[PDB]
Design a protein around this motif. Structure first.
Motif, PDB file in Angstrom:
ATOM      1  N   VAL A 139       0.951  -1.269   0.041  1.00 32.67           N
ATOM      2  CA  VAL A 139      -0.009  -0.015   0.002  1.00 32.67           C
ATOM      3  C   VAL A 139       0.786   1.436  -0.053  1.00 32.67           C
ATOM      4  CG1 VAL A 139      -1.912   1.195   1.158  1.00 32.67           C
ATOM      5  CG2 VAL A 139      -1.616  -1.219   1.446  1.00 32.67           C
ATOM      6  N   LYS A 140       2.062   1.186   0.536  1.00 34.42           N
ATOM      7  CA  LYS A 140       2.987   2.383   0.567  1.00 34.42           C
ATOM      8  C   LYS A 140       3.152   2.693  -1.116  1.00 34.42           C
ATOM      9  CE  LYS A 140       6.766   1.499   2.890  1.00 34.42           C
ATOM     10  NZ  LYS A 140       7.999   1.988   3.791  1.00 34.42           N
ATOM     11  N   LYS A 141       3.505   1.938  -1.963  1.00 37.56           N
ATOM     12  CA  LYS A 141       3.862   2.278  -3.370  1.00 37.56           C
ATOM     13  C   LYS A 141       2.294   2.878  -3.773  1.00 37.56           C
ATOM     14  CE  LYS A 141       6.283   0.305  -5.839  1.00 37.56           C
ATOM     15  NZ  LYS A 141       6.491  -0.434  -7.130  1.00 37.56           N
ATOM     16  N   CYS A 142       1.256   2.272  -3.426  1.00 35.85           N
ATOM     17  CA  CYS A 142       0.181   2.599  -4.041  1.00 35.85           C
ATOM     18  C   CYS A 142      -0.195   4.250  -3.723  1.00 35.85           C
ATOM     19  CB  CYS A 142      -1.035   1.681  -3.522  1.00 35.85           C
ATOM     20  SG  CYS A 142      -0.991   0.221  -4.315  1.00 35.85           S
ATOM     21  N   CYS A 143       0.000   4.420  -2.238  1.00 39.94           N
ATOM     22  CA  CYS A 143      -0.059   5.681  -2.123  1.00 39.94           C
ATOM     23  C   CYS A 143       1.158   6.539  -2.698  1.00 39.94           C
ATOM     24  CB  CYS A 143      -0.105   5.909  -0.552  1.00 39.94           C
ATOM     25  SG  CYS A 143       0.294   7.599   0.064  1.00 39.94           S
ATOM     26  N   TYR A 144       1.935   6.071  -3.044  1.00 42.00           N
ATOM     27  CA  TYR A 144       3.178   6.803  -3.398  1.00 42.00           C
ATOM     28  C   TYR A 144       2.636   7.585  -4.690  1.00 42.00           C
ATOM     29  CZ  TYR A 144       7.568   7.192  -1.244  1.00 42.00           C
ATOM     30  OH  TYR A 144       8.776   7.354  -0.585  1.00 42.00           O
ATOM     31  N   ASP A 145       2.355   6.631  -5.670  1.00 45.19           N
ATOM     32  CA  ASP A 145       1.718   7.350  -6.941  1.00 45.19           C
ATOM     33  C   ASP A 145       0.500   8.129  -6.729  1.00 45.19           C
ATOM     34  OD1 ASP A 145       3.421   5.391  -8.000  1.00 45.19           O
ATOM     35  OD2 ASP A 145       1.550   3.887  -7.623  1.00 45.19           O
ATOM     36  N   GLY A 146      -0.326   7.639  -5.731  1.00 42.63           N
ATOM     37  CA  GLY A 146      -1.779   8.594  -5.585  1.00 42.63           C
ATOM     38  C   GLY A 146      -1.115  10.015  -5.255  1.00 42.63           C
ATOM     39  N   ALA A 147      -0.190  10.091  -4.548  1.00 48.25           N
ATOM     40  CA  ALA A 147       0.530  11.617  -4.332  1.00 48.25           C
ATOM     41  C   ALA A 147       1.164  11.933  -5.554  1.00 48.25           C
ATOM     42  CB  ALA A 147       1.428  11.485  -2.980  1.00 48.25           C
ATOM     43  N   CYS A 148       1.548  11.376  -6.044  1.00 48.54           N
ATOM     44  CA  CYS A 148       2.104  11.729  -7.636  1.00 48.54           C
ATOM     45  C   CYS A 148       1.267  11.491  -8.742  1.00 48.54           C
ATOM     46  CB  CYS A 148       3.512  10.580  -7.718  1.00 48.54           C
ATOM     47  SG  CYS A 148       4.479  10.659  -6.389  1.00 48.54           S
ATOM     48  N   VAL A 149      -0.082  11.397  -8.446  1.00 48.51           N
ATOM     49  CA  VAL A 149      -1.019  11.176  -9.366  1.00 48.51           C
ATOM     50  C   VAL A 149      -0.733  12.011 -10.747  1.00 48.51           C
ATOM     51  CG1 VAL A 149      -2.069  13.132  -8.228  1.00 48.51           C
ATOM     52  CG2 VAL A 149      -3.395  12.072 -10.022  1.00 48.51           C
ATOM     53  N   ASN A 150      -1.308  11.247 -11.892  1.00 48.88           N
ATOM     54  CA  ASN A 150      -0.843  11.870 -13.065  1.00 48.88           C
ATOM     55  C   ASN A 150      -1.021  13.527 -13.170  1.00 48.88           C
ATOM     56  OD1 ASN A 150      -0.616   9.397 -15.006  1.00 48.88           O
ATOM     57  ND2 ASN A 150      -0.215  11.245 -16.255  1.00 48.88           N
ATOM     58  N   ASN A 151      -2.348  13.801 -12.985  1.00 42.03           N
ATOM     59  CA  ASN A 151      -2.616  15.439 -12.684  1.00 42.03           C
ATOM     60  C   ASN A 151      -3.709  15.473 -11.982  1.00 42.03           C
ATOM     61  OD1 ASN A 151      -2.126  18.126 -14.282  1.00 42.03           O
ATOM     62  ND2 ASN A 151      -4.168  17.676 -14.117  1.00 42.03           N
ATOM     63  N   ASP A 152      -4.927  15.037 -12.563  1.00 39.96           N
ATOM     64  CA  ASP A 152      -6.256  15.312 -11.993  1.00 39.96           C
ATOM     65  C   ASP A 152      -6.884  14.208 -11.341  1.00 39.96           C
ATOM     66  OD1 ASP A 152      -7.314  18.160 -12.064  1.00 39.96           O
ATOM     67  OD2 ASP A 152      -9.095  17.170 -12.809  1.00 39.96           O
ATOM     68  N   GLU A 153      -8.052  14.323 -11.061  1.00 36.31           N
ATOM     69  CA  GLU A 153      -8.612  12.883 -10.347  1.00 36.31           C
ATOM     70  C   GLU A 153      -8.118  11.844 -10.806  1.00 36.31           C
ATOM     71  OE1 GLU A 153     -10.085  11.971  -8.050  1.00 36.31           O
ATOM     72  OE2 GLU A 153     -11.505  13.088  -7.286  1.00 36.31           O
TER      73      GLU A 153
ATOM     74  N   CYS B 176      -4.447   8.883  -1.298  1.00 36.79           N
ATOM     75  CA  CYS B 176      -3.195   9.849  -1.237  1.00 36.79           C
ATOM     76  C   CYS B 176      -3.519  10.568  -2.525  1.00 36.79           C
ATOM     77  CB  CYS B 176      -2.209   8.679  -1.419  1.00 36.79           C
ATOM     78  SG  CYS B 176      -1.393   8.426   0.358  1.00 36.79           S
ATOM     79  N   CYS B 177      -3.897  10.443  -3.349  1.00 35.52           N
ATOM     80  CA  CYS B 177      -4.151  11.230  -4.798  1.00 35.52           C
ATOM     81  C   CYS B 177      -5.152  12.246  -4.736  1.00 35.52           C
ATOM     82  CB  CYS B 177      -4.046  10.180  -5.906  1.00 35.52           C
ATOM     83  SG  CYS B 177      -5.345  11.060  -7.168  1.00 35.52           S
ATOM     84  N   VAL B 178      -5.972  11.699  -3.743  1.00 36.62           N
ATOM     85  CA  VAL B 178      -7.046  12.886  -3.551  1.00 36.62           C
ATOM     86  C   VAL B 178      -6.682  13.749  -2.639  1.00 36.62           C
ATOM     87  CG1 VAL B 178      -9.750  13.228  -2.795  1.00 36.62           C
ATOM     88  CG2 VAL B 178      -8.860  10.872  -4.070  1.00 36.62           C
ATOM     89  N   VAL B 179      -6.219  13.370  -1.640  1.00 38.10           N
ATOM     90  CA  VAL B 179      -5.641  14.273  -0.487  1.00 38.10           C
ATOM     91  C   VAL B 179      -4.749  15.103  -1.112  1.00 38.10           C
ATOM     92  CG1 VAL B 179      -6.218  12.621   1.351  1.00 38.10           C
ATOM     93  CG2 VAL B 179      -4.002  12.679   0.150  1.00 38.10           C
ATOM     94  N   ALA B 180      -3.839  14.443  -1.766  1.00 37.05           N
ATOM     95  CA  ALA B 180      -2.763  14.996  -2.563  1.00 37.05           C
ATOM     96  C   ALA B 180      -3.582  15.990  -3.735  1.00 37.05           C
ATOM     97  CB  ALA B 180      -1.963  13.972  -3.325  1.00 37.05           C
TER      98      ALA B 180
END
Length: 74
Positions: free
Chosen positions: A18-32, A54-58
């Protein structure tokens, strides 16, 4: 803080992956559509909500600021 509230929620996961998953979440491509921008969330279940979260909070961290908070906090 290029990853403070996100590296904390990532490390506080009940699953090393889950660490990596949230890693990309924060590094999300750009939008939702984060992993959606990827191609198709197909890296695991904990990923969907781990990275998505992590991508939404991010998403809010980068959808309001544009400096230390954004440039870093994202």
């Amino acid at each position: 803080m290029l990853q403070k509230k996100i590296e904390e929620i990532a490390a506080k996961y009940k699953h090393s992956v889950v660490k990596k998953c949230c890693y990309d979440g924060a590094c999300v491509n750009n939008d939702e559509t984060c992993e959606q921008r990827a191609a198709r969330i197909s890296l695991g279940p904990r990923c969907i909500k781990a990275f998505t979260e992590c991508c939404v909070v991010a998403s809010q961290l980068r959808a309001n600021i544009s400096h230390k908070d954004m440039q870093l906090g994202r």
